[PDB]
Design a protein around this ligand. Structure first.
Ligand SMILES: CC(C)[C@@H]1NC(=O)C(C)(C)/C=C/c2ccc3ccc(nc3c2)[C@@H](C)OC(=O)[C@@H]2CCCN(N2)C(=O)[C@H](C)NC1=O
Length: 165
């Protein structure tokens, strides 16, 4: 029987450790999308999230990260190539803690993702939901205090380490 994978991020604020966020990846519903995020979290293909930052944090909305090639929301790449398709839209943006793919149009998933800090139901059917925060929502809430209305962060919020549990 297959078990959904768990990954973790160790978060830092201007280099100072803050805490750990862990995620369940819904490989039972979106295996291709879950596998991309899993592999980028372990770095096992030779690239991935370690060291990257959350470039946009809007309190009461979401935290966005995963751009390890341009560091500002314009880049990133998947383990399948620069982009891959929307796998399905079975899962919805139901509340805080949902983990979903960022994109720039249909079938443009890369490595960027966001963590909801509110219900974002208007994104249902256009961003692929593929996981949820398991432990550490308190750490996501602490990250949120470094965001702003326009999303610029007041301190640099990084993934100091990440991997699979
Ligand atoms: C994946 C990456 C390559 C894409 N980048 C772009 O398309 C380019 C590079 C053109 C920048 C877009 C951009 C910039 C600032 C900004 C500022 C504020 C907003 N949206 C913003 C969107 C605000 C309304 O919505 C968000 O914050 C949403 C939330 C869900 C994740 N999410 N953001 C995306 O998936 C956006 C839609 N896509 C990208 O970030």
């Amino acid at each position: 029987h297959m078990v959904n994978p768990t990954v973790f991020f160790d978060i830092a604020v201007d280099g100072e450790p803050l805490g750990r966020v862990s995620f369940e990846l819904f490989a039972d519903k979106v295996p291709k999308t879950a596998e991309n995020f899993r592999a980028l979290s372990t770095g096992e293909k030779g690239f991935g999230y370690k060291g990257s930052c959350f470039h946009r944090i809007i309190p009461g909305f979401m935290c966005q990260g995963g751009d390890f090639t341009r560091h500002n929301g314009t880049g990133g790449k998947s383990i399948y190539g620069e982009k891959f398709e929307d796998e399905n839209f079975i899962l919805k943006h139901t509340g805080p803690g949902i983990l979903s793919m960022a994109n720039a149009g249909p079938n443009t998933n890369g490595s960027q993702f966001f963590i909801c800090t509110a219900k974002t139901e208007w994104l249902d059917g256009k961003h692929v939901v593929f996981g949820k925060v398991k432990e550490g929502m308190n750490i996501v809430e602490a990250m949120e205090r470094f965001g702003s209305r326009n999303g610029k962060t007041s301190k640099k919020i990084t993934i100091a380490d990440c991997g699979q549990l």
